[PDB]
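Why predict the complex rather than its parts? Because the way molecules touch one another can change local conformation, and only a joint prediction can capture that. The input here totals 540 residues.
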Amino acid sequence: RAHIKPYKFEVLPKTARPNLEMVHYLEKMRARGCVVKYVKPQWLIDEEKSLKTELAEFEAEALIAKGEAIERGDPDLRESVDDLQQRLLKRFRLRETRAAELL
Amino acid sequence: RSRSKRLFVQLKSAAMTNFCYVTRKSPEKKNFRIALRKYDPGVNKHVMFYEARLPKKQITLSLQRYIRWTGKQVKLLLDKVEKAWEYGRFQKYFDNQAPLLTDRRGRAVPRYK
Amino acid sequence: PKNLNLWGKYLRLVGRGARRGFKKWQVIPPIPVKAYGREPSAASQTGLYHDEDFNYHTKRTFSMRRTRRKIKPNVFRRTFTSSLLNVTIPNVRVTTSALHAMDDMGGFDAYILRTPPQELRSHMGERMRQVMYYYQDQPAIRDWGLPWKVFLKVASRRDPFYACYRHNLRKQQYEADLRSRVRSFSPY
Amino acid sequence: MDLQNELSVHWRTDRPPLPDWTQKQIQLWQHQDPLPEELQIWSRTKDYYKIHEERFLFKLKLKKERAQAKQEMKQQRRRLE
Amino acid sequence: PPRLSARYQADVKKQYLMNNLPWVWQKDFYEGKMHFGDREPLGPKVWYRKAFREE
RNA sequence: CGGCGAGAAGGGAAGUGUGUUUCAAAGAA
RNA sequence: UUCUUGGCAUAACGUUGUGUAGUUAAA
RNA sequence: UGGGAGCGAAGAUAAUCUAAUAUGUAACUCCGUUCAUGGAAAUCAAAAGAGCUUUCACUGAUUGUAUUUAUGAAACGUGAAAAAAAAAAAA
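Output of the joint prediction:
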């Protein structure tokens, strides 16, 4: 209401925090590929900081076991740690969906 | 009404998937356990199904109305409420049928729980 | 909501229609008169029924039936000795609720003197307090020991001598009559 | 502040304590106690509200149970001290 | 009780907000507060029941 | 080149997880 | 191009409701 | 006076009957209507925020109570009219 009719309010309100359902919906749309803009809570950041490391740990195994223990190619052409962690987190958060087969 | 003397048995899956089947047998074979190999969608595999040894004051509309009106013998309803509460139910999130017990003013908005 | 001490918790924040159409036969048990806002009764105004008055109740069976019946309060006859009035008050209709509050207050004179009118719910107690203050004001008349009901009216307080005179006169008359009545039917 | 304190002295200085009953009595002279919920229940309108609702009673039961848990935390401090 | 109610104090707070002074006369101004949204939710019970069943 | 007069009852209500919000049973056209 | 199968009933099960049972990590 | 308080049945509908509607309606008693009623939060909301009381419109015949027949100016919220915290230690 405030956003659509700013003229109706003498003093503009403050953005409220989302609940569990809305946070899940926003994170779901982020996977779809919509630019989501909202403040993140602390419980999610805390959990993700560990989840990313866990997923990285699991990924490394598959790499090293095979034999490819050391990376190759140009240093300026390989992926970054943040991108790798984001990709692993997205893969993890879509294991129970049909979209995994398309990967 | 039906005059059938046939007993009612209950076959349960061996996988603990909460899968059950319905059938009938003769009354003479009272002390006989039935075991089959049926499809179980819970595991997408053929599993064993064994006959289970399946074994109170009933509540009617009249009784319900009486209770609700007078307020006598409310423990019968309170026991069901406690059971429901104990079991996974009345959850704030991911629930439409009965997300909450009552509204702020003390009302049950969901007709079908 | 507001006024939690009073009945009708679930009736204030509702539609006007609900309030207007509210029925009285929907309540089985009685409700306190103070909480319900019921008007005092004539029998209560003539006694000391602190939290007691005529109430109503309804019944209900398994057949969804309902009725309404009247119920009377519990009243007792006793005697109280008032030191300030200097006269006995026989046959005082009281109740256990008032009796209890008398204990708390300290007695019969202090109960009447230190009870607010809204809690007393009795005009007879206000008249007795008035008479007590009149005796306080006028010790001389206090010595006579006449019944407290003689000076109940304001005109009797304005003219106390006349009141005692008339009381004695009428007592004389009554006894005179009685004597004759008896002598007429005397056996001997 | 000084001035205010001079004029706002207490009424219970250099006096012995009082029973809880007495305290209650004192309270009564200013403020009244709330009405029992047992009676209040009846106030519900049959038009929009169910007189005797099992869920409504269960909510009050849970609140009453939580009250004791709240009281225990306050009571533990005296034993600790 | 105070002379002025909270109801009326909200008007003074709104006037302060209009005048750009956020709020100074607060019970706790200099003390941090943990937002309710920063809490860790437990989630429904059916999830855990199903997980236990699967196990 | 902004730095501890840093407080306002300990009581009511709200989810029954409340580190959260609000309020003061007690004043006049 | 795959050789078969979702019983048996010449009398076929009482609809709806209640109770019981089952379902809701979504816009 | 279809205003407010006490008490308060039936004909009728459910094509008989119980609940229920009629209706807290009719009769009886009392207050006598804007100089009235009401009222300046231990309220509502839930993570934003509104700010005594009162009238109209919409939300909405939605939610709810019932069922064999009905009843229901619901709560939050929006628009609009009227806008009112306290004259105050005494002389």
